[PDB]
């Protein structure tokens, strides 16, 4: 990896654009105000450790960057002097300072989450050089926030229909590994989902957490054995019962997810599970149920049709909250077309049809880790303050056509209010310590990670009220 080649091209030319005699460039990250009232701050420690800490500048990196950018711009615009400065004076270590809200902290929109400044006036251009690599934290932030929002829906509906929050941390399972853009995205996204839930099929996320965060538990996330269409359809169109029988017998002591929509989901629930192999199901443990998996059709209408069939072939109880509960050796998983909107649609339809949320689990692939953008939480990195000719000025943008794009002014700090809420203090006002100390702790300074958090601490901060 080469940090000198890990920015937007045009940032190569910015050192020549700042006001002459600019000694400081101070920039901040925030989730700009536009549903998602509060964001989970997660993922920066990964970026600091993997990409910014230690000797990140070398003579070969400088040369390679210079050789690439000479052809890339068809002009020598690369600041070789500026980069050799960092190498000589600092031994390749970035003279930068990043103050940030503790990871896992739940902060409402329009608040400073982290700040960047150069610790050496010759590196005034370095602050916004590393914007690109830092802005990419929109991803773990958005995944963790969106995952926590679904956990709130799942908490509301499970508690309403059952009376408790038993098994909430397993109600949303990650199926996203294939539906993400890369192996790195898989690890980052999966880890961000694991801030709120304990179930994932994206193995990549476990190694990231082990490496960059750590948990007291040997693993941060768990899974169950499961079928796929290949394991079902490999038996032949005539032998779907055989497949179903084989699989449930091979995983008879553990919970097993069996995809039941390969030919006819309705017939598999009515004839194969409900009659032909009913004897194999009603014998299962509460600790090792059969999790029936539909995977096609309208997600809500399929879940209700599947519950109806099962409710007719298996004994259903009425729980303390007056809702229908399947036998404990039988559960359902919706893993198709699940995003925050369809999940909410399904749990509402279920409550309307007097079905408990104890009966269902949800699997989400693309909707959980892919169908997300930087615009969702309005993740913005902006220069709020500069020091030119020794004088500090408040910097900001205010486009005429978009008042949502009106960034903060001056040096910023985040403080806890006397009522336990959060407040972003602009223009150095925080130095007065009216609402106490600033919550933005120094995490990085001159090539060193100064403050780290374990995944156990992150999970603790991201907790719901309920």
Pairing of strands 360-364, 330-334: parallel
x/- track of binding to ligand CVP for residues 344-373 (CB under 6 A): -----------------x-x----------
Residue 206 interacting partner from ligand CVP, its own copies, none (CB closer than 5 to 8 Å by kind): its own copies
Using CA atoms, how far apart are residues 86 and 141, in angstroms rounded to an integer? 30
Counting every residue written for the chain, the total comes to 466
Residue nearer to its own copies on the CB measure, 74 or 320: 74
Token pair for 82? 């500026």
What's the closest the beta carbon of residue 57 comes to its own copies, in angstroms?
16
Residue 297 interacting partner from ligand CVP, its own copies, none (CB closer than 5 to 8 Å by kind): its own copies
Q: Counting beta carbons within 10 angstroms of the beta carbon of residue 50, is it exposed (0 to 12), middle (13 to 18) or buried (19 or more)?
A: middle
Residue 76 interacting partner from ligand CVP, its own copies, none (CB closer than 5 to 8 Å by kind): none
Residue 293 interacting partner from its own copies, ligand CVP, none (CB closer than 5 to 8 Å by kind): ligand CVP
The answer to whether residue 299 forms part of the interface with ligand CVP (CB under 6 A) is no
What's the closest the beta carbon of residue 455 comes to its own copies, in angstroms?
15
Residue 289 interacting partner from its own copies, ligand CVP, none (CB closer than 5 to 8 Å by kind): ligand CVP
The answer to whether residue 8 forms part of the interface with ligand CVP (CB under 6 A) is yes
**CB of 350 closer than 8 Å to CB of 357:** yes
Token pair for 181? 């853009």
Query: How many residues make contact with ligand CVP (CB under 6 A)?
Result: 23
Residue 422 β-bridge partners: 416
Q: Which residues are annotated as a binding site for diphosphate?
A: 178, 229, 293
Using CA atoms, how far apart are residues 462 and 236, in angstroms rounded to an integer? 47
Residue nearer to its own copies on the CB measure, 377 or 439: 377
Using CA atoms, how far apart are residues 81 and 184, in angstroms rounded to an integer? 33
Map tokens 């009220």 to a residue: 465
- Residue 65: strand, helix, or coil: helix
Q: Which residues are annotated as a binding site?
A: 178, 201, 229, 293-295, 335-336, 366, 374
What's the closest the beta carbon of residue 331 comes to ligand CVP, in angstroms?
5
Token pair for 29? 């990250």
Using CA atoms, how far apart are residues 161 and 158, in angstroms rounded to an integer? 5
Token pair for 323? 């809702």
Using CA atoms, how far apart are residues 26 and 335, in angstroms rounded to an integer? 44
- Residue 402: strand, helix, or coil: coil
Residue 443 interacting partner from its own copies, ligand CVP, none (CB closer than 5 to 8 Å by kind): none
Pairing of strands 330-334, 290-293: parallel
Using CA atoms, how far apart are residues 371 and 373, in angstroms rounded to an integer? 7
What's the closest the beta carbon of residue 334 comes to ligand CVP, in angstroms?
10
Residue nearer to its own copies on the CB measure, 394 or 446: 394
Instruction: Give the count of alpha carbons within 13 A of 223, CB side only.
Output: 13
Residue nearer to its own copies on the CB measure, 140 or 430: 140
x/- track of binding to ligand CVP for residues 116-155 (CB under 6 A): ----------------------------------------
Region binding ligand CVP by CB under 6 A among candidate stretches 27-35, 71-79, 300-308, 327-335:
327-335
Restricted to residues 151-190, the positions that interact with ligand CVP (CB under 6 A) are 167, 170, 173, 175
The answer to whether residue 193 forms part of the interface with ligand CVP (CB under 6 A) is no
Residue 263 interacting partner from its own copies, ligand CVP, none (CB closer than 5 to 8 Å by kind): its own copies
Query: Which residues are within 8 A (CB) of 317 and not within 5 positions of it... i.e. 6 or more apart?
Result: 324, 325, 327
The answer to whether residue 287 forms part of the interface with ligand CVP (CB under 6 A) is yes
Restricted to residues 221-280, the positions that interact with ligand CVP (CB under 6 A) are 223-224, 226, 255, 257
**DSSP states of 291-323:** EEE--SS-HHHHHHHHHHHHHHHS--EE-TTS-
What's the closest the beta carbon of residue 169 comes to its own copies, in angstroms?
15
Q: Which residues are annotated as a binding site for beta-nicotinamide D-ribonucleotide?
A: 201, 293-295, 335-336, 366, 374
Q: State which H helix or E strand residue 230 sits in.
A: helix 229-233
Can you give the binding site for ligand CVP, defined by CB under 6 A? 8, 10, 167, 170, 173, 175, 199, 201, 223-224, 226, 255, 257, 286-287, 289, 291, 293, 331, 333, 335, 361, 363
């Amino acid at each position: 990896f080469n940090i000198l080649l890990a920015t937007d091209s045009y940032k190569v030319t910015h050192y020549k654009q700042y006001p002459p005699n600019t000694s400081k460039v101070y920039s901040y990250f925030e989730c700009r105000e536009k549903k998602y009232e509060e964001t989970v701050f997660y993922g920066l420690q990964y970026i600091l450790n993997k990409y910014l800490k230690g000797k990140v500048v070398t003579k070969e990196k400088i040369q390679e960057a210079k050789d690439v950018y000479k052809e890339h711009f068809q002009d020598d615009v690369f600041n070789e002097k500026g980069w050799n400065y960092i190498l000589e004076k600092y031994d390749g270590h970035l003279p930068i300072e990043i103050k940030a809200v503790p990871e896992g902290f739940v902060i409402p929109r329009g608040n400073v989450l982290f700040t960047v400044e150069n610790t050496d006036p010759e590196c005034y251009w370095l602050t916004n050089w590393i914007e690109t690599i830092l802005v990419q934290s929109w991803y773990p932030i958005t995944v963790a926030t969106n995952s926590r929002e679904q956990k709130k829906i799942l908490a509301k509906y499970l508690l309403e229909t059952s009376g408790n929050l038993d098994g909430l941390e397993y109600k949303l399972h990650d199926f996203g590994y294939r539906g993400v853009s890369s192996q790195e995205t898989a690890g980052i996204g999966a880890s961000a989902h694991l801030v709120n839930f304990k179930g994932t099929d994206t193995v990549a996320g476990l190694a990231l957490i082990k490496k960059y965060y750590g948990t007291k538990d040997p693993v941060p996330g768990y899974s169950v054995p499961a079928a796929e269409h290949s394991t079902i359809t490999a038996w032949g169109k005539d032998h779907e019962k055989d497949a179903f029988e084989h699989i449930v017998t091979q995983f008879s002591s553990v919970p097993v997810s069996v995809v039941s929509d390969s030919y006819d989901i309705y017939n598999a629930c009515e004839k194969i599970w409900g009659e032909d192999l009913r004897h194999l199901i009603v014998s299962r443990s509460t600790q090792a149920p059969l999790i029936i998996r539909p995977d096609s059709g309208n997600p809500l209408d399929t879940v209700l049709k599947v519950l109806e069939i099962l409710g007719k072939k298996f004994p259903v109880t009425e729980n303390s909250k007056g809702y229908k509960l399947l036998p404990p050796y039988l559960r359902v998983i919706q893993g198709d077309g699940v995003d925050i909107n369809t999940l909410q649609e399904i749990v509402e339809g279920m409550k309307q049809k007097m079905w408990s949320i104890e009966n269902i689990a949800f699997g989400s692939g693309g909707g959980l880790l892919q169908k997300l953008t930087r615009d969702l939480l309005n993740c913005s990195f902006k220069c709020s303050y500069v020091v030119t000719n020794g004088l500090g000025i408040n910097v900001f943008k205010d486009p005429v056509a978009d008042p949502n794009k009106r960034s903060k002014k001056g040096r910023l700090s985040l403080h806890r209010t006397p009522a336990g809420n959060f407040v972003t203090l602009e223009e150095g006002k925080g130095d007065l310590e009216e609402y106490g100390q600033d919550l933005l702790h120094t995490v990085f300074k001159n090539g060193k990670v100064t403050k780290s958090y374990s995944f156990d601490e992150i999970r603790k901060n991201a907790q719901l009220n309920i």
